[PDB]
Amino acid sequence: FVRQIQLLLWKNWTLRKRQKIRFVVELVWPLSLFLVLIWLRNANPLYSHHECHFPNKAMPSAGMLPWLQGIFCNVNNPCFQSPTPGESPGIVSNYNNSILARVYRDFQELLMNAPESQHLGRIWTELHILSQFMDWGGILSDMSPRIQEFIHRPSMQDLLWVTRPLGPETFTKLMGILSDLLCGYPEGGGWYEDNNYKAFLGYDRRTTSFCNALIQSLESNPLTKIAWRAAKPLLMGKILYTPDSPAARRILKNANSTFEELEHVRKLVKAWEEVGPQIWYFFDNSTQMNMIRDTLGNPTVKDFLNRQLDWRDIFNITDRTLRLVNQYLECLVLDKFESYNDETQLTQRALSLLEENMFWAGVVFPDMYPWTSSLPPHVKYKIRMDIDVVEKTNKIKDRYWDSGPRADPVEDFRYIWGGFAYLQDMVEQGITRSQVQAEAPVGIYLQQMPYPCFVDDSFMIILNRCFPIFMVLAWIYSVSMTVKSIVLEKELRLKETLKNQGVSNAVIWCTWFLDSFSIMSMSIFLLTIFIMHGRILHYSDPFILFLFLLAFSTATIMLCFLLSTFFSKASLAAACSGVIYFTLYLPHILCFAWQDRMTAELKKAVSLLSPVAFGFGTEYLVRFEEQGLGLQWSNIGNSPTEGDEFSFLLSMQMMLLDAAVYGLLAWYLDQVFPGDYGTPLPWYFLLQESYWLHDSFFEREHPGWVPGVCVKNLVKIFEPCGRPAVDRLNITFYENQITAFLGHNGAGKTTTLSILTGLLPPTSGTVLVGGRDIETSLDAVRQSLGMCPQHNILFHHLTVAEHMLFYAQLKGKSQEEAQLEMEAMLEDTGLHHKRNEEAQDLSGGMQRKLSVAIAFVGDAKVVILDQPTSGVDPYSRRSIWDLLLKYRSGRTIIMSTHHMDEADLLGDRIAIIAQGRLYCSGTPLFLKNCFGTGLYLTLVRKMKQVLDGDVNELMDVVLHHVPEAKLVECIGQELIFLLPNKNFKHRAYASLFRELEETLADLGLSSFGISDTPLEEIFLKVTEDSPQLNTGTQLVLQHVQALLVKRFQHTIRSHKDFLAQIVLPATFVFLALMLSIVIPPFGEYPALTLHPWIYGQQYTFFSMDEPGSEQFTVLADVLLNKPGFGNRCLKEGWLPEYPCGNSTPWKTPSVSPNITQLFQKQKWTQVNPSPSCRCSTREKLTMLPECPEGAGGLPPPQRTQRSTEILQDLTDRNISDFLVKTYPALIRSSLKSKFWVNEQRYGGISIGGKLPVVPITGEALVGFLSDLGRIMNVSGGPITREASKEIPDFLKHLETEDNIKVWFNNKGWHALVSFLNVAHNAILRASLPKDRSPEEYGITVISQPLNLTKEQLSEITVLTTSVDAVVAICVIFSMSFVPASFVLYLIQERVNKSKHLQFISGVSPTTYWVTNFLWDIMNYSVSAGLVVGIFIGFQKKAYTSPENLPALVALLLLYGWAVIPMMYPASFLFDVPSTAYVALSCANLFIGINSSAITFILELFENNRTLLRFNAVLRKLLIVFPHFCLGRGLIDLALSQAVTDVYARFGEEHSANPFHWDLIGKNLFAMVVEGVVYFLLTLLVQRHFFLDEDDDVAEERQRIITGGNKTDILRLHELTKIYPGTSSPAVDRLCVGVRPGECFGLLGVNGAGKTTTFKMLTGDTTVTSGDATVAGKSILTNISEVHQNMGYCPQFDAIDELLTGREHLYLYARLRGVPAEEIEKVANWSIKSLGLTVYADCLAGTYSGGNKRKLSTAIALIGCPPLVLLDQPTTGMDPQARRMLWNVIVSIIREGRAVVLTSHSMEECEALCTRLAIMVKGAFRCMGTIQHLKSKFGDGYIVTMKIKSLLPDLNPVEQFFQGNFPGSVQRERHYNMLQFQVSSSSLARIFQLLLSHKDSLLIEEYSVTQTTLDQVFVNFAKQQ
Ligand SMILES: *[C@@H]1O[C@H](CO)[C@@H](O)[C@H](O)[C@H]1NC(C)=O
Ligand SMILES: *[C@@H]1O[C@H](CO)[C@@H](O)[C@H](O)[C@H]1NC(C)=O
Ligand SMILES: [Mg+2]
Ligand SMILES: [Mg+2]
């Protein structure tokens, strides 16, 4: 058993060593597929980041001025590297380096603090007041130098130098100068609606016209448009509140403090607009004019005072600046809060407002009723906002933790730039202002927590989605190859011929599994090494990956085993295998979309498919990679997400279970659906059963004669045509005998012998073999059987010696005995010189000898030979005769022959069948006694060229010498007579033979040989008693019509192949689309009350700064102990889901003394207060840095409050260092015991802060301005008074001191708003009046987004884009598997000679290829129409939109037009169909998928500009492949529609045309050019480099060489061919000339070079030397006319397996140009005059062995060519059929044409052949006419005898011959016959002497020939 696997594996590895290219490709293909990933990985480095310390973010509780400053400066999240001054303990400004700050600092330190300056100013003011009442100088001069250095210092100097440019490039520069002016940051900085496909796309307002023009100027340009779209609602929007109760009115009246404060500046600018003209009037006409005149008069008045030490223009610019400001500020909408009454009405008005983009928010107070006016203690509200302006509500944090602070100022701060945090703060400030009478002014500053230096690997996003698909597409080639190999091996009968030799089924399955597993193991080892050392996966243990890949290889091998039991034709198993393998992977892509509602049970159930479990395992690999973990043998078994029972170990466990199930199911189905050549198939309950899985022509059984094989009432009916092939046999083959099985063609010989084996199931009767019935016990029978099939089936690239060694060892023989057996059986069959020639380079006869040879190796007790010698020369048949007669001791040999002398000699009991049933059977002597026995004399006639002599005088002579004589046959010089055998004169016959011998030339006879009754005459008795269209347009149209009809007639009968190659890919696309529409329905967004305890079990900290105040002390208390941190545990109940726990006393954690030693040892104080922990990445990646033991100082004291959370009082510590340096430890402590990471600190509140406020005190400013108004006569104004009336409340709410900071972590989405809510609860509860318990009161915010049917942009567009990309790659799959199906039929034709036979007819390469291209275009058009119809049906708007449908149609049709002529040249490489199919399909798959993946992933995630430069080039490099063109077209058609949908969502409706020359038009034009160029190229590939002698022979050579004759048709001249790598000419130096009236016969030993001569004569192979002129036109130069003057019948039949005989004749009569009116008669004649009358309407596949030769001969003869080359026309044909063919050929050569006939039956080439030529070793020996040959090379008579009873009885006759005929050699003494070459005087003496002693001896049969041709041929074969 192990030995048998050893042998099969050795054979497989030998055949694999013979072909190394396929091996290398099979080991390299997946590595080749895994190249774009390695290139991208080498393209994207790590790029570790830095600390990223973030600045403050003010809020409307902190006043207005810092609010706007923090809106303007912090609009980008600058990401500094060094800590901001905002994270200092009691400092919150964060703008200390601003130039205004420096100038103000200088102004304060110099001027105001200076006491003398204040005194001087007061003195000047008092003097001015005294002067006004009426209506010092040194001190003022003293402060004049004080002013100087104030300008000189670089603050004021810088202010002037930077205001001097004041602004070219306002968009570029104005914000630059403002940002350097207002704040002073030290240089901080830090699909997709991209223009990639953008370019292709292409109101009264009830407001002042100023703002009409303003909004249009904003709306018109995208640079101003996308910013305005997000900024508009805040400046112009509305706010809507439902309850309308006076309580809500009170809350919102208290909440307009910001908007009233913003309206105050509008009041002031209006006041200046009014009052300015008064200033101008005072400067123009006032007492100032007298003042100036006095100043002008100073040189005459105060010249000394003057010497001691534009107005319009400055007033002008100031007037302009204020007005330009005024026009903008005028139409801000600062009356926002607009009441309503119900939720539904609010939503209706929200729909009304959102279209114009005004809706800001809607505030709903659920607890309120319209008739309410008292605020409850615990008040709640909900801020209903849009969904593109508020973060998602159903989820609280992203599914997978990835490193990164999440600080993008656009896609993460939706709560800030959108306007949720601001409005929440205004409303909560309103509430805390309405409950308590007091205020407690405390502003709130956010602060984002800092971060360590991460690495941010940019590759893991790409490898996240394209890794499983590539790791699955890697193995599609191996899967297709394994399934195709299994099906092809079981289709070519190569598996049944193994089961006959003894091997079981278990061994075959085991070797298939072992070989496939070894190959997959090699490729997998290579793949894991390549991935590891390619740095694609960094941390993952390679051993785990290797084991995972082994598990998947086993699973996919068993899947291949299951798939191989479905199909039965390799042309049908090459497409379905790959498509079904990929179809079992789409469920994984569907499972990626849901990502939820995936119960582990359902995940396992879906994973019950192996390629889905592989996808799951790959997902877990990728997830564990992006965490720095990897699967180090402990990580296995636990998922990286929140809660999954699914894991990695269980993934490959399910894979192994899948492999087991598939293997068991394949094994079960194999024995119930065995296929075509299957044995009697067991019933479906094989496991259930306890048993393991004229009646006188027949001779009676003689005594003894034990039977070996019995057949009883056998019936076999091939269904489609009835007509049972084997009707009712009652045969019984015996033990020690060679039973010859004869019968006419299509009688039931091969079918009966196949039923005798297991190859076919009988449909009735029983077949006992050796006593063991055949359907029940077929294994014991086949342990001792050897068969030789009619069509030789044997491995190609195995040699001869290896064939015999394989088959001899496969039956128990030790290595050594196989050597002896092979040597002996090479000696016995004459194959010694061909020991090492491959079994495909052998000649036909040598293959036939090898088959019968390998049928006898080992000891088989039932040997079944089917045509053992059909195509073997008359000499090599003696070797086979001795071989049979030697192995007849106990074997029940059963030979089915068509040579009657063979069956008479060898057969010991013959049985003739006819029409299925047995006709007669018995010992041949008994048969000849039953039917008419007689004595036949077969006299030939010569020619002078009309056949010499006449049948009149010969007839008269024969009837004169014997009056009863009947003429039996007279076909072409044969003229066989029949004479009576009983009661003859003994003298009349002798006189007749004397008369014939003495006059052998007067009658023209040349030969005559008597014979006792042969078997052939008995068998004949049984059988009887049982013009051209002219060239040009007409002929080309006829050729096109004929070829199209042939293709159609072949297609319509094999409908399964047409479906599985055309319609199935469309079904695959349809299934992909049907899975595309199964997506979860959109559910509405929930309430999501915002509180910090959402995440649960977290760390929070607080830091009490500024501890001297009392209000902050009570604030810290009411935030710490009494009411708790947040809103939970407020003594009344809140969210019963979250309980009210108990607290823990103040506790400080322990620490190692190592830390304490470090902390009292060094002196790193107040900068770097903890060891600056290294965070490098280049050495080891370690995304989160490793940091020493003293990371963040000694741990701060902690406790657990009533709410479950850890409070860390980091009061007197560095905050930023603590969080930065203890983040990684906090993450790592979360990683363990859970294997999924999550941060445990989400924020805290740091009480304390200060904001330096200028001391204006309010009243001083208004008094100062009023004093200037009284003095300057500028006082007075309605609007001026109205604006200046509320000044103190304008300076109150500007800036707020004593603030609160709120540290928040953004990786939890709802952290900032929840902690803002907590802070406002603290400020309310701190501000409360006394005696009122703080616990009762609180606030809570609810965030329910607006109740619209809409998804967020960040999710809906990616879903649709990914879906369309997947659909595109599925379409590429489908349309790449189709065009490879057009090479199956081309190779099927080329491997046969059907293409060459059509070329021998009128068809010329251009017409053939053009017609094939037309048919392929039609079929592809059908498939593309199916795909397009599917897209129309599913309403995929991206492709089937009325603007994008022509693009799709053109794309698909031109891809079909452009890829087919690319597949045509590949039909010249592969020599087996279904291997070209697999290879071409896999190549197309790889090219198209890779090109589309590149144009997709690189475009979406390759920001690097260096990659883009290479990519741009590669587009133009890859334009050459039409697959790339189709991929780009489809992906761009998806992306353009995605972008258009994004645009139309906002309301622009941008429409694009697809045919832009940059979009897809280049692809279309390139496809056209590619199609034309490739068709010309395939035509070129077709046209160019397509993939001392005797005396008579010497005389003919001189005749040809010196002067060539002018009457010959065929004139060979020094023909020669040396086969490549042989070093000995197969055919060398032939010179013959065939006249137009003779049948030149080319006899020859096997492997002498006969078929090669025909091959080079027609034009198949390549001549090596010399011409061969056919009717004038040479071969080497021009072959078209040679083909026009020739008809060829190949040795091996070249027919189409699915066209009847009639349609074959119709095709080949149309091709030769017979007119369409005279084709019925030609077909009828060729059908009637060659047999074929019954089988003229059955497919050429359902033909018998000889009925294919009949068809080939009929094909060769249509069209009347004047030179017909028949290459063995009669091999395996009935005597009657070959008689009719002789009649045809004789008619031919009598009509006036010539035929070159090759045959191995010497009766033939003696009857109808005019001139012979025996060819040995590639050169002639005789080349003479029949008479002259039998004269020069022969003498004497041949007395052949047959004695009856064995070998020791042969002695008396030898003594008789030696005593009578003195000189008489002995030739060919077989087991029972003798053949002496007597040299007597005359034949009458031999006849009389042999007949008179016939009774004394035991002569059964006899024959006295006269130097037959067999003697000549056997002499030649013996010599060489
Ligand atoms: C809001 O949507 C919810 C479903 O999530 C529905 O119950 C409710 O009636 C809707 N309210 C309005 C005002 O449309
Ligand atoms: C503290 O721990 C370190 C860690 O190995 C050790 O080497 C050292 O000896 C300990 N004692 C000190 C630093 O005093
Ligand atoms: Mg047969
Ligand atoms: Mg041959």
Author numbering: 3 to 137, 273 to 303, 308 to 331, 339 to 350, 362 to 468, 498 to 881, 914 to 1164, 1199 to 1280, ...
What is written in the article reporting this PDB entry?
ABCA4, also known as the Rim protein or ABCR, is an ATP-binding cassette (ABC) transporter essential to vision. Transporter assays have demonstrated that ABCA4 actively transports N-retinylidene-PE across disc membranes. These studies provide direct evidence that ABCA4 is an ATP-driven importer, transporting N-retinylidene-PE from the luminal to the cytoplasmic side of the disc membrane in photoreceptor cells. It consists of two homologous halves, each containing a transmembrane domain (TMD), an exocytoplasmic domain (ECD), a cytoplasmic nucleotide binding domain (NBD), and a regulatory domain (RD). Over 800 mutations in the ABCA4 gene cause Stargardt disease, the most common form of inherited macular degeneration.
The final model contains 2 ATP molecules, 8 lipid molecules, and 1920 residues. In the presence of ATP and absence of substrate, ABCA4 exhibits a conformation very different from that of the ATP-free structure. The two NBDs form a closed dimer. The two TMDs are also in close contact, leaving no cavity at their interface. The ECDs are positioned differently from that of the ATP-free form, placing the hollow channel directly above the EH3-turn-EH4 cleft. In ABCA4, this role is fulfilled by the mainchain carboxyl group of T2070 in ATPase site 1 and the side chain of K1054 and mainchain carboxyl of D1061 in ATPase site 2. For example, in the ATP-bound conformation, D1102 in NBD1 forms a hydrogen bond with H2202 in RD2, and R2107 in NBD2 forms salt bridges with E1270 in PH1. The helical subdomain of NBD1 moves together with TMD1. This twisting motion, not seen in any other ABC transporter, places helices TM1 and TM2 within van der Waals’ contact with TM8 and TM11, closing the TM cavity completely. ATP binding induces a major conformational change that closes the transmembrane pathway to release substrate.
